[PDB]
Amino acid sequence: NPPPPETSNPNKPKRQTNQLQYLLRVVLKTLWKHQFAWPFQQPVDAVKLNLPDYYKIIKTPMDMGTIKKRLENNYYWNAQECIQDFNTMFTNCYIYNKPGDDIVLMAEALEKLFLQKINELPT
Ligand SMILES: Cc1cc(/N=N/c2ccc(S(=O)(=O)Nc3ccccn3)cc2)c(N)cc1O
Numbered sequence: 001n002p003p004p005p006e007t008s009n010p011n012k013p014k015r016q017t018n019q020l021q022y023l024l025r026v027v028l029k030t031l032w033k034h035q036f037a038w039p040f041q042q043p044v045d046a047v048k049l050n051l052p053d054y055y056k057i058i059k060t061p062m063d064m065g066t067i068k069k070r071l072e073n074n075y076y077w078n079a080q081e082c083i084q085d086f087n088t089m090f091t092n093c094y095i096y097n098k099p100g101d102d103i104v105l106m107a108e109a110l111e112k113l114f115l116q117k118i119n120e121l122p123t
Contacts, residue, residue: 002055004043005062007069012077018122019079024071027086027117032064034113036106040064040089057096062088079121086114 031037042065046054055061062085069075076082093107 001043001046002061005066007066007075008073009075012075014074015077016074017079020071020074020076020082022122023076023079023082024068027114027121028064028068028071030117031086031110031113032068034110036109037064039103039106040110051096054096058092060088061092062086064089083118090114 032041040063043061043063044051044054044058064086067082067085067089070085071082090107090111093103097104
């Protein structure tokens with residue numbers, strides 16, 4: 001496995017916004033507690049899971065464990081950066097896996113919920 005994505009940025013300034021607070025306390029928390037969250041709570045462990053070619057296929061890995069730590073560490077300056085990371089996580093699943101796969105159905109359920117929660121992101 002590669003190192004996990006960075007979760008801190010020392011050369012960056014930090015802020016908190018209402019949108020960032022919402023992304024952590026509402027969006028991330030709600031997805032985290034979904035019945036299908038567990039495969040998405042940490043980086044894909046291709047060695048342990050014996051996933052052929054995962055990191056040959058997926059060059060931009062992302063997961064909710066990483067997103068959570070980024071939020072907790074005020075890694076994101078712009079809310080969009082966080083939204084993009086969720087989207088990368090879902091897209092990776094669709095790149096690597098096939099229609100009907102259990103992991104795809106799980107991703108789909110999480111994405112649906114994500115969209116519901118981002119729809120209610122405060123202005
Ligand atoms: C994001 C992602 C995760 C995957 N698999 N994740 C797993 C996590 C845990 C297990 S397990 O073997 O540790 N636990 C299981 C496996 C099956 C049934 C119940 N528990 C298996 C796959 C997978 N493939 C493809 C993907 O694109």
